[PDB]
Design a protein around this nucleic acid. Structure first.
Lengths: 157, 158, 56, 53, 56, 173
RNA sequence: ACCUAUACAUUACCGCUAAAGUAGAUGAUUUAUAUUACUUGUGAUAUAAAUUUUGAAACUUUAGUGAGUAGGAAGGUACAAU
RNA sequence: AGAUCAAGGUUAUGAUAUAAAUGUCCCAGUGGGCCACUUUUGGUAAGCAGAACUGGCGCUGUGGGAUGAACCAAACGUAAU
RNA sequence: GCUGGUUCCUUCCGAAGUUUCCCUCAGGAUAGCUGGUGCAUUUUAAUAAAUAAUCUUAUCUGGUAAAGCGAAU
RNA sequence: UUAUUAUAUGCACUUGUAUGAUUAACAAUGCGAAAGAUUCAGGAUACCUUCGGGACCCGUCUUGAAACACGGACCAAGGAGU
């Protein structure tokens, strides 16, 4: 009985398509004879354009340690662990303001008022979507409630 | 506050266990022990000239004394820790044989003979000792009375 | 009724520490070369290692 | 785990599936399912799914 | 000379150093008791394969 | 586990003074196929001499309940031991299969009586047809047909938006 | 389903314990080439080129391994005068 | 019992050996201890005393019951996962 | 035999609180543990047919539970 | 009979597979600019500024000291294994 479920959901590889490995539809269609393809709805909220917003929530805190070489994030789009795994491997970048310039504009133009350390998210951590993240240096400690970002780089389909 | 000394603590040890009191047998006055016939030291209550004292009784030993009517042993006892040898003299009727050699001597002469029969075909020796193994994989007919055969308890209430 | 063969070839993996271990289980476990947690070796099973394996 | 519709269809309570296979087509639900005015609202899982860019 | 068990076996696994198994993710289910009430150490003998797919 | 069912036969290893020992059989519901192998000894040590290891366990057999699509109800006899009032016991629970009819029966017996699993022996399982269930919380479901608007949900509470906008209004009639 | 330890594993690194290797450099060694003995093809000669140093108390290499007061030995540095 | 010839399988239970084997300095210390489980005296008893067999605390940080020398995980080269 | 202080860093190793004796019972000798110093050697030491430690196999070994009063005491 | 596999590939060449704790082509960013001096990472050197966890304040007798146990106001020079 489950043998067509080894078959029918290769129609996504037949509707994308690639080598077309299924003839039965699984279309999510409006037809009365088309009541399948089984979405794990619902959620309807973007948080994905560029610098898709996600505020920050302290380090990968033990109860009585820190391990501040890493950091942990709060990703406002996501709310189940199937959501957040689309944020694997993105960079993580956070700007924060300061006084002087001290650097010329040579690699593409900078009058230099903004200052920003950098980094890279890795893996999904919390069973609702909190996804820990490592930086270039270390997340400067007073940011627990600053509006850090995640840009789309790099991405796929 | 005492052990210290010389026969204290002989409640069930040093006497005769039940229905064996009175006159000694005369089998044990006959036995013969060479150098190396490994022997035991144990307790008795019918030759009251001699004993092994409160710690030894229940240990066995080698024999390196051959004398008039005595046996002088080597025996291991626990000091903490310099486990030494001791030379104890004792009249003979305190003493029983080891039988722990007495399996091993027929472990010898089988091996001299089962190799001797192996000396006509060659293979194989198989002459060491091995305990029971994981056995086999039978198939078992009922053959005798098919199953259920269902003993399930119900017994508490009494 | 066909029985499966009862087997030789066990495989033994330690679980618990180096410390708070029982008295004569300190020599048996150095007598299989399990020392650290999550190390393993194999045995040749008979009765004569079960009542070494039971005392750990 | 389930919500209920509003279409009670008669069966014996110890019915095999084949008469249910018979009676479900007889009770013309598949006709009247997609005309239910808020199962027109059901078509947001059947058209507003994935809402192409 | 291990998986089939033979007469050269005793020298065929002192030849191995003990391994260094990692730690089996998903976890250990309790680590409290013997297998047949709570579940971990002991006479498990057949479900060792679901461990070693993880633990190693 | 989901308390699958195994039948099991012991051996009493074949010692020459009387070969072909009589090979008694149980019916063991158990959380695992590994754990009934040392539960059978606990049942067997009530009746015969037979101690592991003087006996083998010839084939455990998983048996595959026969009528799952039908809704046949069972009674179970029971031996619980509470604090010191160890007893006999008869219950039932109306379940789909037998294997679901022992998980539920454990997780009612641990639910109202505290009755750990080390004091329960499933001594008998019978497929009761009808008309002998005492069991007032069951046999009111015998009454086909039934109107029954016990409108429930999971109450998934509520769902995604942890600051919603639309007033979650259960009843919806 | 997840959760965290200076624990477990793997890559680097430190010191320590164990094991092992290296000294005819008025040579060794390739790289080419002239030739040749020619043994098909392997070698010796000659030319041209370049690599070849350390308290052998050195140097290379390999595995394992590391808590600590009471206390003992191990090399290391201050402040002296001769 | 001893010396000395004659015959002799593969050496005789498992599993190892992070190496085994010993003579000095009698080598600095230390010769007051504490606790839990079982086993247990003295006492009605106690966070008291009094012990045999282990493990630990003193020597020891540690992750965990907020806390706490012993409880239960684990016994601490510098580092990322 | 009683109290106070007994000064530089890392590496290695890592105990005692016990028995005896003493006008000793707050201390000392004593063995014990530890550390150092090498030194002799195994197809258990150098580019097994020999050992020493835990179970098995076999063989002796004890009266504590558990019993036992329709045996002694 | 039917399956099966390896052996029956020398001759030079190749940025070329794998092998000596098997990580590296590309691209961007920049002139060690006479002196002068911008750029990229790092940098609690010992502060100050801003936050997250940690956290009793030092000898010592003792089974046990953060001790509601004794000694310590601060500092330079002198002091105890000869």
């Amino acid at each position: 009985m489950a043998d067509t479920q080894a078959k029918s959901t290769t129609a996504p590889k037949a509707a994308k398509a690639q080598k077309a490995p299924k003839a039965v539809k699984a279309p999510k269609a409006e037809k009365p004879a088309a009541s399948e393809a089984k979405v794990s709805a619902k959620k309807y909220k973007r948080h994905g354009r560029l610098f898709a917003k996600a505020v920050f929530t302290g380090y990968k805190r033990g109860l009585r340690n820190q391990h501040e070489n890493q950091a942990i994030l709060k990703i406002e789009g996501a709310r189940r662990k199937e959501h957040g795994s689309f944020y694997v491997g993105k960079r993580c970048v956070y700007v924060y303001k300061a006084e002087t310039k001290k650097c010329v504009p040579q690699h593409p133009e900078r009058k230099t008022r903004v200052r920003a350390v950098w980094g890279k998210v890795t893996r999904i951590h919390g069973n609702t979507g909190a996804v820990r993240a490592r930086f270039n240096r270390n997340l400067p400690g007073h940011a627990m409630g600053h509006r850090i970002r995640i840009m789309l780089y790099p991405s796929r389909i | 506050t005492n052990s210290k000394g010389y026969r204290r603590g002989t409640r069930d040890m040093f006497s005769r266990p039940f229905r064996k009191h009175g006159v000694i047998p005369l089998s044990t006055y006959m036995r013969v022990f060479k150098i190396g016939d490994i022997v035991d030291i144990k307790g008795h209550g019918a030759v009251q000239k001699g004993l092994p004292y409160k710690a030894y009784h229940g240990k066995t030993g080698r024999i390196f004394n051959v004398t008039q009517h005595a046996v002088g042993v080597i025996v291991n006892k626990r000091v903490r820790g310099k486990i030494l040898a001791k030379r104890v003299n004792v009249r003979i009727e305190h003493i029983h044989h080891s039988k722990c050699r007495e399996d091993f001597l027929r472990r010898v002469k089988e091996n001299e003979r089962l190799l001797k029969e192996a000396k006509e075909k060659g293979q194989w020796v198989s002459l060491k000792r091995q305990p029971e193994q994981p056995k086999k994989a039978h198939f078992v007919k009922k053959l005798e009375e098919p199953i259920a055969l269902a003993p399930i308890p119900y017994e508490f209430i009494a | 009724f066909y029985v499966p063969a009862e087997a030789k070839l066990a495989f033994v993996v330690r679980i618990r520490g180096i410390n708070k271990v029982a008295p004569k289980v300190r020599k048996v476990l150095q007598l299989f070369r399990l020392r650290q947690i999550n190390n393993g070796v194999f045995i040749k099973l008979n009765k004569a290692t079960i009542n070494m394996l039971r005392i750990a | 785990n389930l919500h209920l519709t509003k279409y009670r269809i008669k069966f014996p309570y110890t019915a095999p599936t084949r008469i249910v296979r018979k009676a479900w087509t007889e009770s013309d639900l598949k006709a009247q399912w997609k005309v239910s005015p808020w199962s027109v609202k059901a078509q947001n899982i059947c058209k507003r799914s994935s809402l192409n860019d | 000379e291990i998986f089939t068990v033979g007469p050269n076996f005793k020298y065929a696994s002192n030849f191995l150093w003990p391994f260094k198994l990692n730690t089996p993710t998903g976890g250990w289910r309790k680590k409290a008791n013997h297998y047949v009430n709570g579940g971990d150490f002991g006479n498990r003998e057949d479900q060792i394969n679901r461990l070693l797919r993880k633990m190693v | 586990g989901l308390l699958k069912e195994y039948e099991v036969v012991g051996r009493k290893l074949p010692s020459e003074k009387e070969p072909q020992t009589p090979l008694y059989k149980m019916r063991i519901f158990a959380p695992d196929n590994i754990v009934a192998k040392s539960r059978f000894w606990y049942f067997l040590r009530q009746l015969k001499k037979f101690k592991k290891t003087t006996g083998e366990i010839v084939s455990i057999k998983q048996v595959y309940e026969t009528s799952p699509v039908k809704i046949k109800n069972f009674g179970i006899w029971l031996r619980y031991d509470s604090r010191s009032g160890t007893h006999n016991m008869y219950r039932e629970y109306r379940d789909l299969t037998v294997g679901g009819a022992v998980t539920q029966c454990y997780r009612d017996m641990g639910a109202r009586h505290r009755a750990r699993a080390h004091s329960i022996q499933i001594i008998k399982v019978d497929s009761i047809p009808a008309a002998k269930t005492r069991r007032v919380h069951v046999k009111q479901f015998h009454d086909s047909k039934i109107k029954f608007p016990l409108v429930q949900r999971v109450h998934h509470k509520g769902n995604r938006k942890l600051f919603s906008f639309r007033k979650p209004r259960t009843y919806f009639q």
